[PDB]
Design a protein around this ligand. Structure first.
Ligand SMILES: C=CC1=C(C)/C(=C/c2[nH]c(Cc3[nH]c(/C=C4\NC(=O)C(C)=C4C=C)c(C)c3CCC(=O)O)c(CCC(=O)O)c2C)NC1=O
Ligand SMILES: *[C@@H]1O[C@H](CO)[C@@H](O[C@@H]2O[C@H](CO)[C@@H](O)[C@H](O)[C@H]2NC(C)=O)[C@H](O)[C@H]1NC(C)=O
Ligand SMILES: *[C@@H]1O[C@H](CO)[C@@H](O[C@@H]2O[C@H](CO)[C@@H](O)[C@H](O)[C@H]2NC(C)=O)[C@H](O)[C@H]1NC(C)=O
Ligand SMILES: *[C@@H]1O[C@H](CO)[C@@H](O[C@@H]2O[C@H](CO)[C@@H](O)[C@H](O)[C@H]2NC(C)=O)[C@H](O)[C@H]1NC(C)=O
Ligand SMILES: *[C@@H]1O[C@H](CO)[C@@H](O)[C@H](O)[C@H]1NC(C)=O
Ligand SMILES: *[C@@H]1O[C@H](CO)[C@@H](O)[C@H](O)[C@H]1NC(C)=O
Ligand SMILES: *[C@@H]1O[C@H](CO)[C@@H](O)[C@H](O)[C@H]1NC(C)=O
Ligand SMILES: *[C@@H]1O[C@H](CO)[C@@H](O)[C@H](O)[C@H]1NC(C)=O
Ligand SMILES: *[C@@H]1O[C@H](CO)[C@@H](O)[C@H](O)[C@H]1NC(C)=O
Ligand SMILES: *[C@@H]1O[C@H](CO)[C@@H](O)[C@H](O)[C@H]1NC(C)=O
Ligand SMILES: *[C@@H]1O[C@H](CO)[C@@H](O)[C@H](O)[C@H]1NC(C)=O
Ligand SMILES: *[C@@H]1O[C@H](CO)[C@@H](O)[C@H](O)[C@H]1NC(C)=O
Lengths: 199, 286, 50
């Protein structure tokens, strides 16, 4: 997307940028919506405003990235947002009630190119992921190299550590885990991510 | 189309006590010979659950609260209990999610359902035993799931309950977590005392305000035309914020647990972090 | 002010937002002025500029 797109906002939480190339993510989800240009600052964990509590709320322990870019001269229709509510929303929740019985709750804004910059339409994409002891199925563009043994080497079975690599023949795995866990919160006897051989 | 009922009896909220039931895996990390404390939402040890059964002119499927998590356990023989519906106010003014087993496919779908008064599955004793309607209508929505096809037996009378299916439902960050467990039994009366862990099964993104839930049952229509109910029972318990102390062994399975808020002996066991206590006098934390 | 105003800057110091609902303040003052759009970043503790 380097020669096609231009992002006004790229903020990540729980993982630094320029590290997503060498990482694998287990469960990845994408949320898409459309707001005004000045309301992008409200899409963050712990914020307040008309978007953060009545339309879309991020959890406090959020891991992922927030991407936004302006899309004037592309979205011209009239769109809606929640102006008031009896209570505030839970994280990652929706409220599709178009109107209450008493009074309408949905306010509207009109998007046109002649509208000022503060009121212009931008697209927001929010990603979320986590890392488990499971196959991830969403990885970066890394090439597998030759496996060497009996030397001090740095291995990259989705995690970096520099040790010596030998052959293990007395390991019982559960067919889900790659490394497991030790008594002192350590990981030992990693698995080859495509074979079943345990190192 | 939904049926008509006038001879239904009011449910009796009987009380049965659980015992070391309703323990599930908190984390997806393989640990062996481990022992640690976890503060989460659990069903308390020795707490009492409510009993609902379908025996005769008594069909018990009321709308029950979904406070912080529900422990569900069913003792059945003829596959009476099929599934549940989750949501708020359970009508067309809001969105509701269903999890269903219509004896051919597993259905997970959240829409703007309009439920009738008594949602039941109807099976003909004759006529090669087909199914029937559940509710009235459901307009536009944004989720679907139909599993693979399978064949399900939908009539069996053994005289004793031979299946025990246990579930734990949780709602967190727009996800519905499902923990499942199965255990073969042979009982006649009620909920058997025991201990079995539950494994994580489903994680469906709903984005729903979930405050109430209702269960789907199945009845039988005789050859004359009247309805006939079959013997089944289920139990509902609620989770509370508690501190537990779980244990792991070889193959990484949970084999024992202690509820630290039950008795002074459990408090002593949780204070020193051991299942075995020697003779003496010890100070305990609150 | 949710259905009538649109704020391009909302930064709080010494207290997090979404906590002002359940708080009581004992001496509140308001200062108002008018500057250019690029000079808003200078309205912060420990800044420089004209
Ligand atoms: C709608 C929710 C639902 C869930 C989440 C579910 C899970 C579920 N059901 C079964 C078997 C499973 N499930 C059932 C039937 C049922 N099981 C139930 O929880 C209920 C309510 C029925 C129907 C009355 C049978 C009869 C079997 C055994 C299938 C076999 O013999 O291979 C498995 C183990 C599959 C295997 O290892 O062969 C799992 C994970 N079944 C469901 O129906
Ligand atoms: C952005 O870069 C992509 C990737 O190189 C360009 O797509 C190539 O376009 C040329 C013709 O210009 C084709 O011969 C290549 O086969 C395309 N590559 C791929 C991988 O499809 C794309 O044209 C560039 N876009 C712009 C606006 O410059
Ligand atoms: C989830 O839905 C419930 C049920 O509608 C909401 O609880 C209602 O809150 C309003 C607030 O004015 C009360 O008037 C109703 O009496 C409540 N209903 C019940 C059954 O108690 C609840 O607010 C919703 N939750 C969220 C987070 O929006
Ligand atoms: C924004 O919301 C306010 C209420 O918070 C609206 O003000 C009400 O407007 C109606 C007519 O639409 C009047 O009958 C009420 O008396 C007003 N209430 C109050 C408390 O002043 C307002 O109209 C909404 N819209 C705009 C554009 O400001
Ligand atoms: C696929 O994995 C196998 C081992 O399971 C390996 O030999 C092969 O090179 C892999 N193929 C590609 C294209 O990466
Ligand atoms: C239900 O009750 C009465 C009495 O059986 C019947 O006449 C009526 O039509 C029924 N209502 C329905 C099917 O909606
Ligand atoms: C459990 O039994 C006690 C006995 O004192 C009773 O007070 C309590 O209400 C019961 N619990 C429930 C959830 O009904
Ligand atoms: C169960 O539901 C599925 C939904 O696609 C349907 O195709 C199937 O025929 C149903 N089976 C029954 C009613 O026995
Ligand atoms: C038998 O089933 C068929 C097909 O559903 C139905 O049309 C018919 O009315 C049923 N007959 C009886 C006697 O139940
Ligand atoms: C569903 O359809 C109704 C009736 O046409 C419409 O009012 C409503 O907005 C629709 N719901 C959506 C698009 O979520
Ligand atoms: C662990 O799994 C093996 C698989 O063969 C089984 O034989 C063994 O009994 C299990 N261990 C325990 C303590 O149950
Ligand atoms: C400790 O208690 C367990 C039951 O929790 C019992 O089986 C065992 O014999 C006791 N003693 C030792 C030394 O493990």
């Amino acid at each position: 997307l380097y020669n096609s797109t231009l992002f006004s906002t790229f903020k990540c939480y729980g993982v630094s940028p320029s590290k997503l190339i060498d990482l694998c993510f287990t469960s990845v989800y994408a949320d898409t919506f459309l707001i005004r240009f000045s309301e992008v600052r409200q899409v963050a964990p712990g914020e307040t405003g008309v978007i953060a509590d009545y339309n879309y709320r991020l959890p406090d322990d959020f891991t992922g990235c927030v991407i936004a870019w302006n899309t004037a001269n592309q979205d011209v229709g009239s769109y809606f947002y929640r102006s008031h509510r009896s209570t505030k929303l839970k994280p990652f929740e929706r409220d599709l009630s178009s109107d209450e019985n008493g009074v309408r709750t949905l306010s509207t804004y009109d998007f046109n190119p002649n509208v000022p910059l503060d009121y212009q339409a931008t697209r927001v994409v929010v990603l979320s992921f986590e890392l488990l002891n499971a196959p991830a199925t969403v990885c970066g563009p890394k090439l597998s190299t030759e496996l060497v043994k009996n030397q001090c080497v740095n291995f990259n079975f989705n995690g970096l550590k520099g040790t010596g690599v030998l052959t293990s023949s007395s390991k019982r795995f559960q067919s889900f885990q790659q490394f497991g866990r030790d008594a002192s919160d350590f990981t030992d006897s990693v698995r080859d991510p495509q074979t079943l051989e345990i190192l | 189309t939904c049926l008509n009922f006038t001879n239904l009896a009011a449910p009796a909220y009987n009380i049965a006590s659980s015992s070391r039931r309703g323990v599930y895996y908190p984390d997806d990390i393989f640990r062996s010979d481990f022992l640690h404390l976890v503060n989460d939402y659990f069903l308390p040890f020795g707490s009492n659950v409510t009993q609902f059964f379908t025996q005769g002119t008594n069909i018990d499927n009321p709308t029950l609260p979904f406070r912080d998590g529900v422990y569900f356990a069913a003792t059945e023989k003829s596959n009476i209990v099929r599934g549940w519906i989750f949501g708020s106010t359970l009508d067309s003014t809001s969105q509701s999610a269903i999890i269903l087993n219509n004896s051919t496919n597993l259905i997970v779908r959240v829409c703007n359902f309009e439920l009738c008064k008594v949602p039941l599955f109807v099976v003909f004793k004759s006529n090669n035993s087909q199914l029937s309607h559940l509710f009235s209508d459901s307009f536009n929505c944004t989720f679907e799931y139909v599993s693979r096809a399978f064949s399900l037996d939908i009539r069996e009378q053994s005289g004793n309950f031979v299946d025990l299916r246990e579930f734990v439902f949780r709602n967190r960050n727009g996800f519905l977590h499902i923990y499942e467990g199965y255990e073969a039994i042979s009982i006649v009366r009620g909920l058997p005392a025991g201990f079995n862990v539950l494994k994580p099964l489903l994680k469906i993104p709903f984005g729903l305000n979930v405050t109430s839930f209702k269960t789907f049952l199945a009845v039988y229509r005789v050859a004359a035309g009247s309805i006939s109910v079959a013997s089944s029972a289920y139990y509902v318990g609620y989770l509370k914020p508690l501190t537990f102390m779980l244990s792991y062994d070889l193959n990484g399975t949970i084999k024992n647990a202690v509820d630290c808020s039950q008795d002074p002996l459990a408090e002593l066991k949780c204070t020193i972090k051991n299942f075995n206590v020697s003779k003496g006098i010890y100070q305990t934390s609150n």
